[PDB]
Amino acid sequence: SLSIIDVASDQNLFQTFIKEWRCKKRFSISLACEKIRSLTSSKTGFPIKGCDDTLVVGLAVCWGGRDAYYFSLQKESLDPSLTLKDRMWYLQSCLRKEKECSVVIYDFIQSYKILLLSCGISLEQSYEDPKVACWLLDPDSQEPTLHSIVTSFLPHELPLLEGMETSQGIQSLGLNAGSEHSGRYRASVESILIFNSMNQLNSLLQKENLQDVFRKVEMPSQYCLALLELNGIGFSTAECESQKHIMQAKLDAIETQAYQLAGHSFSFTSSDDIAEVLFLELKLPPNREQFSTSKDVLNKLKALHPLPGLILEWRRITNAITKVVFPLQREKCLNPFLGMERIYPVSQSHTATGRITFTEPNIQNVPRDFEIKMFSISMRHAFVPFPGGSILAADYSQLELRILAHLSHDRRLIQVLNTGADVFRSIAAEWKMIEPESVGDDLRQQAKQICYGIIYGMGAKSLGEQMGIKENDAACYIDSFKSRYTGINQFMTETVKNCKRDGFVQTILGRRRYLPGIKDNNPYRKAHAERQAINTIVQGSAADIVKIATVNIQKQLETFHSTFKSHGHREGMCPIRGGFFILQLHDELLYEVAEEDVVQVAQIVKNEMESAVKLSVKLKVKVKIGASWGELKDFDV
DNA sequence: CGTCCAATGACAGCC
DNA sequence: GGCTGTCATTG
Ligand SMILES: Nc1nc2c(ncn2[C@H]2CC[C@@H](COP(=O)(O)OP(=O)(O)OP(=O)(O)O)O2)c(=O)[nH]1
Ligand SMILES: CN(C(=S)Cn1[nH]c2cccc-2c1C(F)(F)F)c1ccccc1
Ligand SMILES: [Mg+2]
């Protein structure tokens, strides 16, 4: 059945364990975490950052069968000759290469950060996370749990999870300290399960030709994101508090001016109070198909009364305060080693198309610079580098357009993209009948939504509502698009044809997203899967290229510079040196770079992004350096 | 009965 | 009166 071998209990048992561990090219580990329920428990270990009530008491190692070698990280040991420092030397020796070696870890990112921050050990091997392999086999599946992995890929070992309800809680069984069971038993069971399950997962990856995407792209991306979560992103409380005051002052002016237009005071959060003022008092025309106060209704009423425009601006500013300012100042944390405050978002790579997003908080959703008549409110000014550094931004110009041109072989789109004329400003120039140089960011952003909207199947009705024209007139723009770019339309038709035949779509690297609704009887559900088939290939291939570029940049930074890998590595152990990954923005990479290395990192980042993948269209990359996320300026190198 | 896609998440407003 | 999804925002 099961066998748990406490290797720190005997010297001869420990030396035999180290001698065998140093010969294994593949094994699994699972950290044993327990919570300090009482001071009388007399449990020793390493404290965890954030969860100070939780200790790392040990570690389980498994390299075959149902045998778990528990590595006790407690001060007390049955063999006092094996001091904790001796065990740390041997644990560090076996977790760092000299020599290919693969370590299977469930929730690799958290385990990597805990091993570094709590135990002072930096992993230096090849990493395999089973939850990432489960995502490659089906990007639309539910986020994996230890119980779900065993239920699907190792059903014979299901009784080993009885009693421990935490197996179905996404988080690692050994890392979930909220369990009442010992970390020794939870880690020993998990190491045996994730090791044998990864063998079946690796077999399924090889059958689906995804074993190289797993080792070269996805798992190295997790390592890059692990350094990101260790770095965090700088945060200026003063700048965030300053713009909060400017926004709260504009709200008071709007509320004062709105009440005067209404004749009385009303609640901006109450739609009934808003509907009574506009429709029952101001006698504004209700919508066709309805006392609705949505964004679509208020935009049609802006031209009849100034109050709808004031309500729309109140909601925009209030959203920037209640859902951005408050979470950022709530999640901020002091970093004594850098002498500044930072925010540490958690990455999320279990997405439908392969994009990367962030949680707690979602830095990607920080609002752009929007004008306020009092000026511009730039929430991104609050994100600053460390004293003596600059924030570096490098983004692909139009990555999804250039991938679409490379896949559709459209000679006209390739010709337009090879020319330095902005497509969005050219669309707005034809739209509003203005010169391209006179197109503002608000109009260019509106033309951007129209461009990608039409490409991914937006209908004539929605296009008319976007372009502010009749539905009959909007269908002519779609007809012109399907005639002006016959290569794109041939790509859209063949993709739906191939997805109806295969039942899935493939990105540029081979990742499959299964879309069973492609043959559904419902006309809305069937067309939704058709639009998903077009978008998953383009948007998914863009995510693949960015992940490739991120991995290559990090490989180059760790060779050009012998400094610390992340800000967490400086804490686990000199002025700051190099560039530090802080944020990924789908088609844009943000790095915190010291002022001395700004020029070299900009050249390293730009070269790796342009040479990540070879397409039939040039991958144009722009680099911008500034004193904050909102003060970025063009940097030509 | 809802026809661009992807994503997170605090409140109005529930059923 | 807690429990969603909805309509904010970003790419
Ligand atoms: N389907 C869809 N995709 C979008 C939309 N907006 C952005 N995207 C995708 C396509 C490209 C990717 C990055 O968009 P950006 O906002 O960076 O715009 P861009 O096309 O890169 O141009 P630029 O960076 O010069 O603004 O996000 C949209 O409204 N619909
Ligand atoms: C008729 N038209 C065209 S073709 C503009 N265009 N150029 C593109 C290169 C790649 C996609 C493109 C589009 C698109 F938007 F159609 F998808 C247009 C549509 C709306 C407003 C103004 C012009
Ligand atoms: Mg961009």
Side-chain angles (χ1 to χ4, degrees), chain A residues 260-287 290-370 372 376-411:
Chain A
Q260 295 175 349
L261 293 179
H264 63 83
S265 66
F266 62 93
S267 175
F268 276 85
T269 61
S270 171
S271 181
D272 294 356
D273 293 358
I274 294 176
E276 181 180 359
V277 170
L278 296 182
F279 306 135
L280 304 185
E281 297 175 359
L282 295 181
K283 302 302 180 180
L284 291 185
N287 194 18
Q290 182 75 0
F291 299 112
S292 181
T293 63
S294 59
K295 180 181 296 182
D296 305 327
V297 182
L298 295 185
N299 281 265
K300 301 178 181 179
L301 304 178
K302 282 165 51 186
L304 294 168
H305 200 271
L307 187 55
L310 297 180
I311 299 174
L312 285 172
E313 191 175 10
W314 188 97
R315 296 177 181 176
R316 176 207 314 168
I317 299 176
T318 298
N319 184 90
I321 300 180
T322 66
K323 300 187 180 180
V324 178
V325 171
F326 291 162
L328 292 184
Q329 293 180 342
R330 177 188 58 183
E331 301 289 342
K332 63 178 181 181
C333 178
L334 172 63
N335 185 280
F337 309 89
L338 294 174
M340 71 178 306
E341 287 176 324
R342 300 179 79 87
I343 297 178
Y344 301 87
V346 186
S347 69
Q348 166 63 279
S349 300
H350 195 102
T351 54
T353 60
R355 283 189 166 193
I356 297 173
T357 180
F358 298 90
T359 50
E360 301 174 348
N362 188 8
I363 309 298
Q364 293 177 335
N365 290 4
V366 168
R368 324 178 79 203
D369 304 5
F370 59 95
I372 291 297
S376 301
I377 294 297
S378 184
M379 289 295 308
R380 293 171 180 173
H381 272 46
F383 296 89
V384 296
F386 49 75
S390 302
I391 290 183
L392 186 147
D395 54 323
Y396 292 106
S397 295
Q398 287 86 12
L399 187 54
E400 292 193 14
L401 287 185
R402 298 172 190 275
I403 293 181
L404 172 64
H406 165 71
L407 295 178
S408 63
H409 317 313
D410 196 310
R411 187 184 70 261

Side-chain angles (χ1 to χ4, degrees), chain A residues 3 54 358:
Chain A
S3 180
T54 302
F358 298 90

Side-chain angles (χ1 to χ4, degrees), chain A residues 355 368 395-401 422 424-425 441 444-445 448-453 455-456 458 466 535 538-539 542 585-588 622 624:
Chain A
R355 283 189 166 193
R368 324 178 79 203
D395 54 323
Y396 292 106
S397 295
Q398 287 86 12
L399 187 54
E400 292 193 14
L401 287 185
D422 191 299
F424 303 146
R425 280 191 286 266
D441 183 74
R444 181 181 182 269
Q445 201 76 359
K448 172 189 303 179
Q449 183 171 2
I450 296 175
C451 175
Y452 290 114
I455 290 177
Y456 298 122
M458 182 191 295
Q466 286 284 310
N535 177 264
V538 181
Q539 185 187 114
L585 215 56
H586 306 297
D587 75 329
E588 184 174 13
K622 291 184 177 180
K624 289 181 296 182

Side-chain angles (χ1 to χ4, degrees), chain A residues 401 413 423 427 430-431 450-451 454-455 467 477 480-481 484-485 488:
Chain A
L401 287 185
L413 178 56
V423 176
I427 294 180
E430 180 184 345
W431 182 20
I450 296 175
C451 175
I454 296 178
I455 290 177
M467 295 185 57
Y477 290 83
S480 296
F481 167 75
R484 187 180 305 179
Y485 299 98
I488 302 180

Side-chain angles (χ1 to χ4, degrees), chain A residues 520-547:
Chain A
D520 197 355
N521 300 270
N522 192 286
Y524 164 75
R525 300 177 181 176
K526 185 171 185 176
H528 173 52
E530 296 183 359
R531 289 168 286 179
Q532 285 176 314
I534 316 294
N535 177 264
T536 295
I537 295 185
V538 181
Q539 185 187 114
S541 301
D544 290 2
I545 294 180
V546 175
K547 286 183 178 179

